[PDB]
């Protein structure tokens, strides 16, 4: 039940709601009040998916799929089987995620550490909410949302992106994707740096941050350093998700033509629109 | 076919890799224990790993993990309930006692050293060539606690020498002695440094250090421990 | 506002850090560059010094050689006109030989030979840089992890531009140099193969790519959060666990029910990241050499 250095931190307090009432652990798990919110929202939503799975005929997770209300239904409710199960499961989903964050705030308080983790989680929650609530509402229908199925939601990704030709041309999607890629680069580098110091050459003694700094400067003329790289991971990550949401909040709402076409604002400028030669003259 | 061989093999590699990774993260905190400190019955499905040895660089010795584990310190807490899983109340003053969010570990009571063997952290005053290079300079600001009362004056910054980074404010009391505050728990503004974790009367109680030109890892832990504890334990004197 | 350690509130500056000498031939470090106050709100203010050995110079030269080759073909495609160049910047594209030349080096300069020339410069630039990766580590007595991990990035790049074009029998199978064309090659690659959503290695790759954003966001937040107990000094927390490492582990344990060590979490990191391209490159490698349509393959796995 406890890690060897753990008892000393298991003290009363930090809760957000409930005072000492749900303030206890089950095995290694802290139980918020929000631990109780999350279990209720998550068990209700799982129950409704298992439900939905019979109304639809299957028990196989590669087939189970829950679709939003069709476009026809606009923003209204929609019978249980014709999209309303999805409406209620989405309400469970948000309930469960926002609880999880709030539970994380409580764990933060008991531990005397900062709020960075749940703040970060929040950008994921916002991305989801962009796909299933903000974008559908700006567009008129729950049916623009994606559905809950392992393979059917990629159906939705293909269909949605291919409505604007090659999605690659969505310029916020480009910045988003750069953030993702650079993030994986920082992750490879940070991991391998720290390990290469803790696990040096062999028989050899443990290296130091001065080594990690040194190796970097040797390789690229720079080193952001140990506080730096953690700030950077965070920034790269969160920036990726922020531009992920931005690229989708704007697609179908303020821009709804073929993304390749947006680029013509550049190529069509007064100063060079009509000069000849090159690809566009 | 070949593509089915590759994918299925990959799933297998992936399972061993998860396993290896999981066991690797057991070189601390393990074996699990009961709330009373003896080995828990169930340790989950992962075995401990064969141990490893880090060689520390300034004839500072060895670490070999996993190995026998204790807190090397008394824990002023008691059970508040009759079975596994509840909070354990502080039996004393939690701040003075280093428990809860004020906890510290018994790290080595020497100073972390740079790559060259010198103490990593020094008061800027004993650090040649080091000066404030941008942003508001805290030195000479009054230091205010969460009760909005002044508790001292900033008299130097302790700096990380190889990373060139502020790490504490050395602040002076009515006393004339000083304490270190973590740079990360203070807000340097126009006419003052504000400290939210601590009320003005809890500064005297900050853990003191033995040299005034060195901190040790143990002292550093007790200090950071103490001030972070205040966010929970000084909430009584915290205003708005 | 209580304070978050995202940007620094004070920069502090000392003598330029020349860094540990170890087995490094110091002949080859440059001397310190200057000091960006700007950089310094966020990470370190000091630029340089860089080390450039002979291998150093080699890499960096063919580096520019590839860049400069792509760049004349761009000015040429622009018919020498400076405004046209700027306008059509993302449209220029240096393409590989047509399917007809197969793997030969025969193709004219102006229809593929320029491509192979730039491809040649890129190949020695990357690989030399790779060995530069290892060498800098040896000189310092550091482990080999950076080069191992960089090897994973190289494997996709390798498979995309060289291993796969060879196995399929021609250089036309490989990727244009240019901002839009390489996007187009991409979209196109997927179409011709039955949509890469059906290729299990693609799907794995996404899980790691997304997974790396998850991990680093977790990890970077975890550190900033415990940064008020010196959490960022990870190596000394590995050698002597302090409350920062403890309160970190226990955040994740109380939340999701298991946790890492300060050292272990870095092995989660190196692998989460490296697996993105490892997995990816198997997925491309198999495309069209062994599976011509992922959908179809998918229909009856074996
Ligand atoms: C043919 C398809 C189109 C295309 C169309 C789209 C579309 C359409 C979309 C994207 C989106 C994205 N695309 Mg695109 N995309 C294409 C080509 C690419 C390529 C490529 C190499 O070609 C790449 C790398 C990308 C990359 C990206 C990212 C910028 C983004 C996905 C990450 C994200 O949004 O996460 C955000 C993360 C989440 C939303 C996860 C949320 C997690 C929540 C909060 C909690 C879940 C908990 C879970 C339930 C717990 C379960 C139980 C536990 C496991 C125990 N695209 C092609 C051209 N792309 C998406 C985007 O920008 O979304 C905003 C999007 O909607
Ligand atoms: C993975 C399948 C595709 C691919 C799909 C995409 C997609 C989709 C996008 C990019 C984009 C980028 N790609 Mg590409 N790209 C590929 C391979 C490459 C290779 C290579 C193999 O050498 C290079 C040099 C580039 C270069 C680039 C940049 C123009 C940009 C950001 C890279 C980065 O974040 O690194 C980080 C660090 C620099 C320090 N791509 C392969 C062929 N790439 C994005 C872009 O923004 O285009 C304008 C974009 O949206
Ligand atoms: C982000 C932009 C697009 C999108 C584009 C893609 C694409 C493209 C792909 C996936 C793939 C996946 N996505 Mg999807 N996906 C989206 C939003 C989601 C959401 C969500 C709540 O918003 C979830 C839960 C998932 C879940 C999944 C997984 C089934 C699979 C691997 C993900 C991963 O490794 O993440 C990183 C996270 C981790 C490593 C943490 C572990 C996450 C675990 C495995 C998720 C389990 C979800 C579970 C099966 C849902 C079960 C219900 C629960 C019992 C409540 N996607 C949106 C609509 N997703 C890949 C796939 O293989 O498809 C079959 C793939 O190629
Ligand atoms: C319409 C397009 C198709 C599609 C077609 C492809 C194709 C084709 C490929 C991918 C690949 C990927 N796609 Mg897909 N993809 C689609 C949809 C998606 C979606 C989505 C639906 O949202 C997502 C999230 C992704 C995500 C991904 C990634 C997991 C994977 C790229 C890994 C990577 O890190 O590359 C970035 C990293 C590299 C390219 C390695 C670079 C290393 C070299 C050594 C560096 C050279 C540097 C050079 C010298 C320049 C230096 C300049 C400096 C500043 C000095 N794709 C749709 C289905 N996708 C790649 C893959 O492996 O899939 C199997 C790939 O080939
Ligand atoms: C900065 C954003 C990056 C990020 C960060 C991030 N994620 C996080 C955190 C952070 C900081 C956490 O603290 C939190 C965590 O606890 O991690 C272990 C988390 C987390 N991110 C997770 C998943 C997740 N994150 C993803 C992405 C990202 N997370 C971003 C790229 C993805 C992607 C890329 O697709 C996934 C799949 C979980 C591991 C965990 C959140 C766990 C949680 O909220 O648990 C509560 C709920 C349940 C246990 C049960 C679900 C409730 C029911 C309503 C079921 C159905 C919902 C429905 C939408 C089903 C969908 C079907 C699919 C097939 C599409
Ligand atoms: C493991 C997967 C991630 C990855 C890893 C990775 N990349 C790496 C490394 C590693 C471990 C290095 O060691 C090496 C490096 O030195 O980084 C500073 C590198 C590197 N990867 C680079 C780029 C790069 N990596 C990419 C991708 C990725 N790198 C993946 C997401 C991309 C993308 C997204 O397409 C790019 C553009 C360079 C910064 C560097 C290689 C420099 C080189 O070969 O130089 C030739 C010299 C000149 C051109 C001058 C006009
Ligand atoms: C302890 O120090 C060190 C390490 O880690 C322990 C590191 O690994 C690294 C990692 C450094 C990198 C190369 C990452 C690069 C970051 C950028 C160039 C940011 C730019 C982002 C985009 C390309 C998106 C464009 C978006 C717009 C226009 C908005 C450094 C430097 C470090 O030295
Ligand atoms: C230095 O510091 C650091 C650590 O520490 C030393 C760390 O560990 C970590 C954490 C990182 C790791 C441990 C590595 C592995 C991380 C990943 C690959 C992320 C993926 C995570 C998962 C796939 C597992 C997610 C599990 C979840 C989300 C929950 C499982 C939930 C159940 C089955 C039951 C949940 C309980 C409920 C409903 C709550 C309420 C309580 C009741 C029981 C009632 C980081 C980042 C860190 O940097
Ligand atoms: C401003 O003006 C100046 C003069 C400075 C010039 C400006 C130039 C500019 C702005 C240039 C822009 C260049 C761009 C946009 C480059 C983009 C490249 C992209 C986008 C992607 C590349 C993907 C590349 C891959 C996948 C390549 C892989 C290559 C190989 C494996 C090597 C292949 C092997 C060859 C060619 C054979 C030779 C070797 C042997 C051993 C037989
Ligand atoms: Fe780290």
PDB file of N, CA, C and O in Angstrom, chain A residues 28-64:
ATOM      1  N   UNK A  28      -3.333   2.820  -3.900  1.00  0.00           N
ATOM      2  CA  UNK A  28      -2.453   4.013  -4.055  1.00  0.00           C
ATOM      3  C   UNK A  28      -3.193   5.292  -4.444  1.00  0.00           C
ATOM      4  O   UNK A  28      -2.630   6.402  -4.467  1.00  0.00           O
ATOM      5  N   UNK A  29      -4.461   5.158  -4.742  1.00  0.00           N
ATOM      6  CA  UNK A  29      -5.243   6.236  -5.290  1.00  0.00           C
ATOM      7  C   UNK A  29      -5.769   7.273  -4.240  1.00  0.00           C
ATOM      8  O   UNK A  29      -6.499   6.982  -3.251  1.00  0.00           O
ATOM      9  N   UNK A  30      -5.410   8.510  -4.442  1.00  0.00           N
ATOM     10  CA  UNK A  30      -6.139   9.531  -3.712  1.00  0.00           C
ATOM     11  C   UNK A  30      -7.699   9.617  -4.098  1.00  0.00           C
ATOM     12  O   UNK A  30      -8.069   9.494  -5.261  1.00  0.00           O
ATOM     13  N   UNK A  31      -8.602   9.870  -3.151  1.00  0.00           N
ATOM     14  CA  UNK A  31      -9.983   9.981  -3.537  1.00  0.00           C
ATOM     15  C   UNK A  31     -10.400  11.393  -3.417  1.00  0.00           C
ATOM     16  O   UNK A  31     -10.780  11.903  -2.329  1.00  0.00           O
ATOM     17  N   UNK A  32     -10.416  12.118  -4.495  1.00  0.00           N
ATOM     18  CA  UNK A  32     -11.062  13.465  -4.204  1.00  0.00           C
ATOM     19  C   UNK A  32     -12.511  13.423  -3.486  1.00  0.00           C
ATOM     20  O   UNK A  32     -13.054  12.341  -3.257  1.00  0.00           O
ATOM     21  N   UNK A  33     -13.139  14.576  -3.189  1.00  0.00           N
ATOM     22  CA  UNK A  33     -14.548  14.717  -3.557  1.00  0.00           C
ATOM     23  C   UNK A  33     -14.609  14.387  -5.048  1.00  0.00           C
ATOM     24  O   UNK A  33     -15.389  13.570  -5.462  1.00  0.00           O
ATOM     25  N   UNK A  34     -13.769  15.098  -5.832  1.00  0.00           N
ATOM     26  CA  UNK A  34     -13.662  14.911  -7.271  1.00  0.00           C
ATOM     27  C   UNK A  34     -13.163  13.493  -7.664  1.00  0.00           C
ATOM     28  O   UNK A  34     -13.231  13.149  -8.842  1.00  0.00           O
ATOM     29  N   UNK A  35     -12.611  12.690  -6.757  1.00  0.00           N
ATOM     30  CA  UNK A  35     -12.414  11.289  -7.065  1.00  0.00           C
ATOM     31  C   UNK A  35     -13.830  10.665  -7.147  1.00  0.00           C
ATOM     32  O   UNK A  35     -14.180   9.910  -8.078  1.00  0.00           O
ATOM     33  N   UNK A  36     -14.690  11.004  -6.179  1.00  0.00           N
ATOM     34  CA  UNK A  36     -16.086  10.550  -6.260  1.00  0.00           C
ATOM     35  C   UNK A  36     -16.786  11.170  -7.488  1.00  0.00           C
ATOM     36  O   UNK A  36     -17.523  10.474  -8.076  1.00  0.00           O
ATOM     37  N   UNK A  37     -16.538  12.417  -7.904  1.00  0.00           N
ATOM     38  CA  UNK A  37     -17.203  12.922  -9.114  1.00  0.00           C
ATOM     39  C   UNK A  37     -16.684  12.029 -10.248  1.00  0.00           C
ATOM     40  O   UNK A  37     -17.504  11.390 -11.002  1.00  0.00           O
ATOM     41  N   UNK A  38     -15.357  11.852 -10.342  1.00  0.00           N
ATOM     42  CA  UNK A  38     -14.935  11.184 -11.521  1.00  0.00           C
ATOM     43  C   UNK A  38     -15.503   9.770 -11.642  1.00  0.00           C
ATOM     44  O   UNK A  38     -15.967   9.403 -12.692  1.00  0.00           O
ATOM     45  N   UNK A  39     -15.517   9.015 -10.575  1.00  0.00           N
ATOM     46  CA  UNK A  39     -16.064   7.639 -10.623  1.00  0.00           C
ATOM     47  C   UNK A  39     -17.551   7.660 -11.070  1.00  0.00           C
ATOM     48  O   UNK A  39     -17.987   6.811 -11.928  1.00  0.00           O
ATOM     49  N   UNK A  40     -18.323   8.613 -10.541  1.00  0.00           N
ATOM     50  CA  UNK A  40     -19.690   8.637 -10.958  1.00  0.00           C
ATOM     51  C   UNK A  40     -19.715   8.960 -12.469  1.00  0.00           C
ATOM     52  O   UNK A  40     -20.156   8.127 -13.263  1.00  0.00           O
ATOM     53  N   UNK A  41     -19.149  10.080 -12.900  1.00  0.00           N
ATOM     54  CA  UNK A  41     -19.222  10.388 -14.340  1.00  0.00           C
ATOM     55  C   UNK A  41     -18.597   9.277 -15.155  1.00  0.00           C
ATOM     56  O   UNK A  41     -19.096   8.957 -16.207  1.00  0.00           O
ATOM     57  N   UNK A  42     -17.513   8.660 -14.724  1.00  0.00           N
ATOM     58  CA  UNK A  42     -16.907   7.692 -15.616  1.00  0.00           C
ATOM     59  C   UNK A  42     -17.684   6.374 -15.615  1.00  0.00           C
ATOM     60  O   UNK A  42     -17.757   5.690 -16.663  1.00  0.00           O
ATOM     61  N   UNK A  43     -18.265   5.987 -14.463  1.00  0.00           N
ATOM     62  CA  UNK A  43     -18.983   4.690 -14.459  1.00  0.00           C
ATOM     63  C   UNK A  43     -20.295   4.864 -15.204  1.00  0.00           C
ATOM     64  O   UNK A  43     -20.602   3.980 -15.966  1.00  0.00           O
ATOM     65  N   UNK A  44     -20.990   5.994 -15.041  1.00  0.00           N
ATOM     66  CA  UNK A  44     -22.228   6.292 -15.792  1.00  0.00           C
ATOM     67  C   UNK A  44     -21.977   6.274 -17.298  1.00  0.00           C
ATOM     68  O   UNK A  44     -22.684   5.589 -18.081  1.00  0.00           O
ATOM     69  N   UNK A  45     -20.984   7.033 -17.723  1.00  0.00           N
ATOM     70  CA  UNK A  45     -20.626   6.989 -19.106  1.00  0.00           C
ATOM     71  C   UNK A  45     -20.162   5.615 -19.575  1.00  0.00           C
ATOM     72  O   UNK A  45     -20.302   5.302 -20.740  1.00  0.00           O
ATOM     73  N   UNK A  46     -19.534   4.803 -18.743  1.00  0.00           N
ATOM     74  CA  UNK A  46     -19.125   3.530 -19.312  1.00  0.00           C
ATOM     75  C   UNK A  46     -20.423   2.697 -19.493  1.00  0.00           C
ATOM     76  O   UNK A  46     -20.690   2.168 -20.585  1.00  0.00           O
ATOM     77  N   UNK A  47     -21.224   2.591 -18.422  1.00  0.00           N
ATOM     78  CA  UNK A  47     -22.570   1.985 -18.443  1.00  0.00           C
ATOM     79  C   UNK A  47     -23.302   2.438 -19.698  1.00  0.00           C
ATOM     80  O   UNK A  47     -23.743   1.605 -20.446  1.00  0.00           O
ATOM     81  N   UNK A  48     -23.428   3.722 -19.970  1.00  0.00           N
ATOM     82  CA  UNK A  48     -24.145   4.091 -21.200  1.00  0.00           C
ATOM     83  C   UNK A  48     -23.497   3.636 -22.514  1.00  0.00           C
ATOM     84  O   UNK A  48     -24.150   3.694 -23.549  1.00  0.00           O
ATOM     85  N   UNK A  49     -22.235   3.220 -22.507  1.00  0.00           N
ATOM     86  CA  UNK A  49     -21.560   2.857 -23.758  1.00  0.00           C
ATOM     87  C   UNK A  49     -21.806   1.380 -23.942  1.00  0.00           C
ATOM     88  O   UNK A  49     -22.270   0.977 -24.977  1.00  0.00           O
ATOM     89  N   UNK A  50     -21.507   0.579 -22.927  1.00  0.00           N
ATOM     90  CA  UNK A  50     -22.010  -0.795 -22.804  1.00  0.00           C
ATOM     91  C   UNK A  50     -23.553  -0.885 -23.140  1.00  0.00           C
ATOM     92  O   UNK A  50     -24.000  -1.884 -23.733  1.00  0.00           O
ATOM     93  N   UNK A  51     -24.349   0.144 -22.791  1.00  0.00           N
ATOM     94  CA  UNK A  51     -25.777   0.113 -23.102  1.00  0.00           C
ATOM     95  C   UNK A  51     -25.934   0.191 -24.627  1.00  0.00           C
ATOM     96  O   UNK A  51     -26.050  -0.832 -25.285  1.00  0.00           O
ATOM     97  N   UNK A  52     -25.963   1.393 -25.168  1.00  0.00           N
ATOM     98  CA  UNK A  52     -25.561   1.654 -26.551  1.00  0.00           C
ATOM     99  C   UNK A  52     -24.870   0.555 -27.391  1.00  0.00           C
ATOM    100  O   UNK A  52     -24.884   0.597 -28.590  1.00  0.00           O
ATOM    101  N   UNK A  53     -24.177  -0.366 -26.756  1.00  0.00           N
ATOM    102  CA  UNK A  53     -23.432  -1.329 -27.489  1.00  0.00           C
ATOM    103  C   UNK A  53     -24.380  -2.419 -27.786  1.00  0.00           C
ATOM    104  O   UNK A  53     -24.188  -3.073 -28.795  1.00  0.00           O
ATOM    105  N   UNK A  54     -25.371  -2.653 -26.919  1.00  0.00           N
ATOM    106  CA  UNK A  54     -26.469  -3.636 -27.205  1.00  0.00           C
ATOM    107  C   UNK A  54     -27.542  -3.080 -28.215  1.00  0.00           C
ATOM    108  O   UNK A  54     -27.696  -3.621 -29.284  1.00  0.00           O
ATOM    109  N   UNK A  55     -28.197  -1.969 -27.916  1.00  0.00           N
ATOM    110  CA  UNK A  55     -28.978  -1.238 -28.924  1.00  0.00           C
ATOM    111  C   UNK A  55     -28.426  -1.180 -30.365  1.00  0.00           C
ATOM    112  O   UNK A  55     -29.105  -0.675 -31.278  1.00  0.00           O
ATOM    113  N   UNK A  56     -27.199  -1.629 -30.570  1.00  0.00           N
ATOM    114  CA  UNK A  56     -26.461  -1.384 -31.828  1.00  0.00           C
ATOM    115  C   UNK A  56     -26.048  -2.774 -32.318  1.00  0.00           C
ATOM    116  O   UNK A  56     -25.752  -2.926 -33.514  1.00  0.00           O
ATOM    117  N   UNK A  57     -26.001  -3.761 -31.389  1.00  0.00           N
ATOM    118  CA  UNK A  57     -25.846  -5.167 -31.717  1.00  0.00           C
ATOM    119  C   UNK A  57     -24.534  -5.821 -31.398  1.00  0.00           C
ATOM    120  O   UNK A  57     -24.432  -7.043 -31.356  1.00  0.00           O
ATOM    121  N   UNK A  58     -23.510  -5.044 -31.107  1.00  0.00           N
ATOM    122  CA  UNK A  58     -22.217  -5.699 -30.869  1.00  0.00           C
ATOM    123  C   UNK A  58     -21.608  -5.671 -29.440  1.00  0.00           C
ATOM    124  O   UNK A  58     -21.957  -4.802 -28.650  1.00  0.00           O
ATOM    125  N   UNK A  59     -20.765  -6.659 -29.100  1.00  0.00           N
ATOM    126  CA  UNK A  59     -19.877  -6.566 -27.908  1.00  0.00           C
ATOM    127  C   UNK A  59     -18.376  -6.448 -28.241  1.00  0.00           C
ATOM    128  O   UNK A  59     -17.514  -6.710 -27.375  1.00  0.00           O
ATOM    129  N   UNK A  60     -18.027  -6.104 -29.473  1.00  0.00           N
ATOM    130  CA  UNK A  60     -16.654  -6.188 -29.875  1.00  0.00           C
ATOM    131  C   UNK A  60     -16.089  -4.746 -29.940  1.00  0.00           C
ATOM    132  O   UNK A  60     -16.678  -3.855 -30.598  1.00  0.00           O
ATOM    133  N   UNK A  61     -14.974  -4.479 -29.201  1.00  0.00           N
ATOM    134  CA  UNK A  61     -14.558  -3.049 -29.051  1.00  0.00           C
ATOM    135  C   UNK A  61     -14.120  -2.431 -30.336  1.00  0.00           C
ATOM    136  O   UNK A  61     -14.287  -1.219 -30.486  1.00  0.00           O
ATOM    137  N   UNK A  62     -13.596  -3.234 -31.272  1.00  0.00           N
ATOM    138  CA  UNK A  62     -13.308  -2.743 -32.671  1.00  0.00           C
ATOM    139  C   UNK A  62     -14.588  -2.447 -33.491  1.00  0.00           C
ATOM    140  O   UNK A  62     -14.521  -1.921 -34.562  1.00  0.00           O
ATOM    141  N   UNK A  63     -15.768  -2.785 -32.986  1.00  0.00           N
ATOM    142  CA  UNK A  63     -17.002  -2.352 -33.664  1.00  0.00           C
ATOM    143  C   UNK A  63     -17.840  -1.345 -32.889  1.00  0.00           C
ATOM    144  O   UNK A  63     -18.510  -0.536 -33.504  1.00  0.00           O
ATOM    145  N   UNK A  64     -17.853  -1.423 -31.549  1.00  0.00           N
ATOM    146  CA  UNK A  64     -18.714  -0.506 -30.744  1.00  0.00           C
ATOM    147  C   UNK A  64     -18.550   0.956 -31.217  1.00  0.00           C
ATOM    148  O   UNK A  64     -17.428   1.467 -31.279  1.00  0.00           O
TER     149      UNK A  64
END
